[PDB]
Amino acid sequence: FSPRQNAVLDQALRLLVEGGEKALTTSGLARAANCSKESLYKWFGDRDGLLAAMITFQQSKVDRVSAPQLADHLEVFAHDLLDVLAGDVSLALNRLAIGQASRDGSKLGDLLLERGRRQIDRRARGLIEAGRRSGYLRFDDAEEAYRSFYGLIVSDLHVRMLLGEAPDDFSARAKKAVVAFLTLYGTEKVHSEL
Amino acid sequence: SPRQNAVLDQALRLLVEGGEKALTTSGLARAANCSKESLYKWFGDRDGLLAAMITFQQSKVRTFEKAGDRVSAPQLADHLEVFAHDLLDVLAGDVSLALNRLAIGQASRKLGDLLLERGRRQIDRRARGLIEAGRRSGYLRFDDAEEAYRSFYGLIVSDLHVRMLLGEAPDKDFSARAKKAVVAFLTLYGTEKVHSELGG
Numbered sequence: 001f002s003p004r005q006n007a008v009l010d011q012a013l014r015l016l017v018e019g020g021e022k023a024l025t026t027s028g029l030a031r032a033a034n035c036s037k038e039s040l041y042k043w044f045g046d047r048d049g050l051l052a053a054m055i056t057f058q059q060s061k062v063d064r065v066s067a068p069q070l071a072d073h074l075e076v077f078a079h080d081l082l083d084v085l086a087g088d089v090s091l092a093l094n095r096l097a098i099g100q101a102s103r104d105g106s107k108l109g110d111l112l113l114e115r116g117r118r119q120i121d122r123r124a125r126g127l128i129e130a131g132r133r134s135g136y137l138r139f140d141d142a143e144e145a146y147r148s149f150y151g152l153i154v155s156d157l158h159v160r161m162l163l164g165e166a167p168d169d170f171s172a173r174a175k176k177a178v179v180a181f182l183t184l185y186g187t188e189k190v191h192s193e194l
Numbered sequence: 195s196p197r198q199n200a201v202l203d204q205a206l207r208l209l210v211e212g213g214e215k216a217l218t219t220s221g222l223a224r225a226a227n228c229s230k231e232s233l234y235k236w237f238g239d240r241d242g243l244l245a246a247m248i249t250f251q252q253s254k255v256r257t258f259e260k261a262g263d264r265v266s267a268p269q270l271a272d273h274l275e276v277f278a279h280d281l282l283d284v285l286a287g288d289v290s291l292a293l294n295r296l297a298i299g300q301a302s303r304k305l306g307d308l309l310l311e312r313g314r315r316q317i318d319r320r321a322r323g324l325i326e327a328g329r330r331s332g333y334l335r336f337d338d339a340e341e342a343y344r345s346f347y348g349l350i351v352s353d354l355h356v357r358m359l360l361g362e363a364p365d366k367d368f369s370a371r372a373k374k375a376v377v378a379f380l381t382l383y384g385t386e387k388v389h390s391e392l393g394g
Contacts, residue, residue, distance in 0.1 A: 020302065091302070092302065094298075094356070094360070095298055095299060095301060095302050096299075097360055098294075098295050098298045098299065098359045098360055099213075099214055099295060099296075099298050099299020099300070099302075100213055100214065100215065100299065101213055101295050101359065101360060101361045102210065102211060102212050102213035102216070102292070102295075102361075103210050103211065103288055103291070103292065103361075104361060105360060105361015105362070106213075106360075106361060109360040109361040109362075110361070112360055113357060113360050113361070113362055144374075147352045147353075148349060148352070148378060150348075150352050150353055151347075151348030151349050151350075151351065151352035151353075152345060152348050152349070153348070154348060154352075154353070155344045155345070155347050155348035155351075156347055156348070156351070156355070158353070158356050159294070159355050159356060159359075160310060162298045162301065162356075162359075163294075163297055163298055163301050163306035163309055163310050164301035164306035164307070164310070165306070165310055176341070180345055180382055183381065183382055184378055184381055184382065
């Protein structure tokens with residue numbers, strides 16, 4: 001997107017964080033962003049295209065290592081992840097998609113399951129593969145290793161925050177999760193080097 | 195009460211089927227054959243109705259078995275797998291998902307605290323009971339018991355509860371997931387005794 005297209009998506013996000021779903025309309029967006037209803041329609045298409053673009057916009061903001069670098073990158077990842085999940089945009093997008101879901105989900109729900117954490121997940125994959133390549137980590141399947149790491153870092157905190165609980169010291173948490181993750185997937189080489 | 199329960203069953207039903215949107219004072223008047231002003235003297239207001247739905251459901255949940263003072267290593271391992279699978283199954287329940295969805299949509303400016311404070315108490319007491327039994331028996335070591343449960347929970351569930359809440363149907367492999375989460379949990383907190391005993 002352009003810097004101006006970017007400005008508009010930022011308005012759309014802000015509308016949703018501030019005034020919920022009621023506020024997120026084409027007209028409210030046209031008014032908030034001082035953009036013709038008409039340009040919104042050609043830039044993003046329908047309501048679904050806008051929601052999609054909003055999610056990719058919010059994505060925009062997201063070889064070999066030593067053992068200390070690995071541990072440290074992994075800790076930075078976990079801290080950044082928690083910061084994202086605790087953030088008001090992420091909480092608002094997920095609350096909207098979840099709040100409106102039935103047994104059958106919702107369209108916004110589809111979009112977040114598809115693209116809502118793409119750049120985070122890619123960063124995790126990259127880091128975990130480098131760790132494996134450098135002989136520091138051993139696992140049969142990178143998806144499974146990442147599933148474990150995510151669970152260790154987050155546990156039930158995302159749901160709890162979605163329900164209105166004020167977050168947990170993310171730095172301490174990121175530390176603890178990386179120690180557990182290296183116990184499960186860490187190689188003799190990573191432990192003897194650290 | 196007899197009538198109040200039948201009504202709340204309709205409200206739970208509407209919620210699973212159409213989400214928060216479908217749970218309207220008139221929708222529920224239609225579904226359960228009651229008055230809209232009858233709904234008022236039963237449950238106070240809209241916000242009180244939502245709470246009675248949450249506490250009505252919380253009433254019908256599976257009561258878990260008091261974890262025995264002491265266990266063998268195979269008993270411990272077995273109990274922990276059954277627990278993990280029970281957890282997944284409770285999270286994947288249609289009513290539980292629908293109530294969580296409802297409470298999540300409200301949370302962005304009291305319903306959340308009800309699930310937060312009371313929603314998982316029986317599950318949580320089960321897990322701590324088990325983890326305590328494992329510790330007592332010399333099979334688990336940890337600095338902090340709640341942190342051990344924290345790790346176990348994240349290992350069993352990872353992001354699956356959030357995905358399901360968003361509308362993703364679960365994979366039908368809870369059994370395999372529970373086994374995997376128990377292997378990981380025992381690596382983290384298992385003592386030499388638990389491993390050499392499970393190793394016959």
